[PDB]
Design a protein around this ligand. Structure first.
Ligand SMILES: NC(=O)c1ccc[n+]([C@@H]2O[C@H](COP(=O)([O-])OP(=O)(O)OC[C@H]3O[C@@H](n4cnc5c(N)ncnc54)[C@H](O)[C@@H]3O)[C@@H](O)[C@H]2O)c1
Ligand SMILES: [K+]
Ligand SMILES: [K+]
Ligand SMILES: [K+]
Ligand SMILES: [Mg+2]
Ligand SMILES: [Mg+2]
Ligand SMILES: [Mg+2]
Ligand SMILES: [Mg+2]
Ligand SMILES: [Mg+2]
Ligand SMILES: [Mg+2]
Ligand SMILES: [Mg+2]
Ligand SMILES: [Mg+2]
Ligand SMILES: [Mg+2]
Ligand SMILES: [Mg+2]
Ligand SMILES: [Mg+2]
Ligand SMILES: [Mg+2]
Ligand SMILES: [Mg+2]
Ligand SMILES: [Mg+2]
Ligand SMILES: [Mg+2]
Ligand SMILES: [Mg+2]
Ligand SMILES: [Mg+2]
Ligand SMILES: [Mg+2]
Lengths: 171, 71, 118
RNA sequence: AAACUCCAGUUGACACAAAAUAGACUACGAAAGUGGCUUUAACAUAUCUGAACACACAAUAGCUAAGACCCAAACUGGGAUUAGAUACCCCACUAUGCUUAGCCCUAAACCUCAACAGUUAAAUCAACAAAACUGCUCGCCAGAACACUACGAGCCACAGCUUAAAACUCAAA
């Protein structure tokens, strides 16, 4: 998070803000503001680090950055409020909306898609091809079918050496 | 409107709940037997797999779990 | 943010009232608050009897403290006021002067048809 | 009648319960829901549509465990009415309504109006409801009853929920 001494986004570019009393600097800092003001500083930090034009707020890049800041705020909220179903819904919806944005950014501008993923720490994932319950009967059988395959592979290799050994003896 | 369609469903549900009440001990014995066969049918399906793959016994360290018991 | 502490103090003599206010303003400063003003609203009869700290009160000293503090200071200050035996009732609200009132053109009528249908 | 008579009245002290008036308002929220006070956090998406099953929710009742307990209250006990029993009435009291941590996943969960976009000119239009329609998409339907059923399958559900037939029968529904 930005330091508490950080000035608000509105007062950072006023002339002479560095020569005012320390008390006036505290009243214009993040320490004396609500969390929404700290998120505006985070968004601006990501916008200048990532996007080519930090003042274009309607680009697909800026929307992903703005939404990524909201997603982090919901995660922090839910870390303290674990039974808040309303905000749990907003988080899952926001994550899904960001994935849709990333899909559209990957399809249109891959070079920018890569910088967004590096800058925001997003690991893009392709969706599963099928949506179906993995119930106990299927989970157990799939585990057995993988064990059966693994054992069959071992036996097929021990039928290569014995055949190889016998062939050498003939010589 | 009238509620005649609701009334038919009401009586059907009442008689069903009444039938289930009277026979809840027979139905519990029947359900238990079905789950036993269901477990056996599941165990056979897994044994069929390793047998059709050329193995003679279950994969080393494999025990088929009971996936239908209340526990 | 900017807050307003509505403070009802036990009816006391001037020396104990000043000691309570100083002790209360220092608690705000210790928690990071920047105190802006202190207003005396006067001693008056309470609108009802208030029991606080094993005592019954019928009169109190009404004071206001306008101050800025971090959002985390409110919870800690509310706890402090609950333990001060000379404080009858202390509430922290967001300062009313921060909220800017939106202009009003006037009273637009609401149609009777909307009243019923809605 | 029973019950109570450490009863009732005044006064004072005193809540893990519930939130007059405002509210003749029609707001917030995806819905369910949400009307005492304060503060903190906070109410997704710069094209729309998109799921019985994926993901996350979901009144009331109910389950498991631990607490609280004013009042209410299935059940139960007592009194009364009754030919008599149950109910309706009275008294007492419990599960439960509350909190916490897990479940359960239902409603006439209904504005009984799917989402989005557009139109008020044509014919206004079976009827009633709620003026009549267009584009587009998903979901769903194809006589009644059998049937919120049977079987199968899944599920922390075990007298449960979800999905959901057929045979026999009828000329209606
Ligand atoms: N079944 C899938 O995993 C899957 C994958 C891609 C697309 N779809 C699309 O979903 C729609 C539903 O297909 P259906 O009628 O054969 O399925 P269905 O509704 O009969 O459901 C059967 C299975 O598909 C899943 N499913 C249902 N609706 C889905 C949806 N909208 N998207 C993804 N999975 C869904 C269910 O959870 C279940 O596992 C179709 O438009 C299909 O093209 C389904
Ligand atoms: K109230
Ligand atoms: K009211
Ligand atoms: K209705
Ligand atoms: Mg019937
Ligand atoms: Mg008597
Ligand atoms: Mg959608
Ligand atoms: Mg489907
Ligand atoms: Mg749906
Ligand atoms: Mg359902
Ligand atoms: Mg529920
Ligand atoms: Mg409960
Ligand atoms: Mg009582
Ligand atoms: Mg009780
Ligand atoms: Mg309560
Ligand atoms: Mg409702
Ligand atoms: Mg839809
Ligand atoms: Mg007509
Ligand atoms: Mg039919
Ligand atoms: Mg039902
Ligand atoms: Mg059923
Ligand atoms: Mg069954």
């Amino acid at each position: 998070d930005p330091p508490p001494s950080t000035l608000l986004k509105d007062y950072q570019n006023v002339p002479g803000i560095e020569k005012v009393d320390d008390v006036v600097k505290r009243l214009l800092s993040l320490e004396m503001a609500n969390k929404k003001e700290m998120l505006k500083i985070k968004q601006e930090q990501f916008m200048k680090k990532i996007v080519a034009n930090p003042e274009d707020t309607r680009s697909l890049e800026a929307r992903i950055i703005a939404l990524s800041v909201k997603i982090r705020s919901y995660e922090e909220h839910l870390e303290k409020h674990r039974k808040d179903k309303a905000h749990k819904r907003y988080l899952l919806m926001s994550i899904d909306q960001r994935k849709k944005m990333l899909k559209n950014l990957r399809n249109t501008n891959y070079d920018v898609f890569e910088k967004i993923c590096w800058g925001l720490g997003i690991e893009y994932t392709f969706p599963p091809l099928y949506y179906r319950r993995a119930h106990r009967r299927f989970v157990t059988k799939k585990a057995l079918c993988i064990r059966v395959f693994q054992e069959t592979q071992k036996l097929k290799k021990r039928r290569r050496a014995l055949k190889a050994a016998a062939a050498a003896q003939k010589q | 409107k009238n509620v005649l369609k609701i009334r038919r469903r009401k009586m059907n549900h009442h008689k069903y709940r009444k039938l289930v009440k009277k026979t809840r001990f027979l139905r519990r014995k029947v359900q238990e037997g079905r789950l036993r066969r269901k477990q056996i049918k599941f165990e056979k399906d897994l044994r069929r797999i390793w047998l059709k793959a050329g193995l003679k016994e279950a994969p080393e360290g494999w025990q088929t779990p009971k996936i239908y018991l209340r526990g | 943010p900017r807050y307003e502490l509505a403070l009802i103090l036990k009816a006391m003599q001037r020396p104990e009232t000043a000691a309570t206010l100083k002790r209360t303003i220092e608690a705000l400063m210790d928690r990071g608050a920047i105190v802006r003003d202190l207003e005396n609203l006067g001693e008056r009869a309470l609108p009802y009897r208030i029991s606080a700290h094993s005592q019954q009160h019928n009169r109190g000293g009404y004071f206001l403290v306008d101050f800025y503090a971090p959002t985390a200071a409110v919870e800690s200050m509310v706890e402090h006021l609950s333990r001060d035996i000379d404080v009858i009732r202390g509430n922290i609200v967001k300062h009313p002067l921060t909220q800017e009132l939106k202009e009003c053109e006037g009273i637009v009528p609401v149609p009777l048809a909307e009243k019923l249908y809605s």
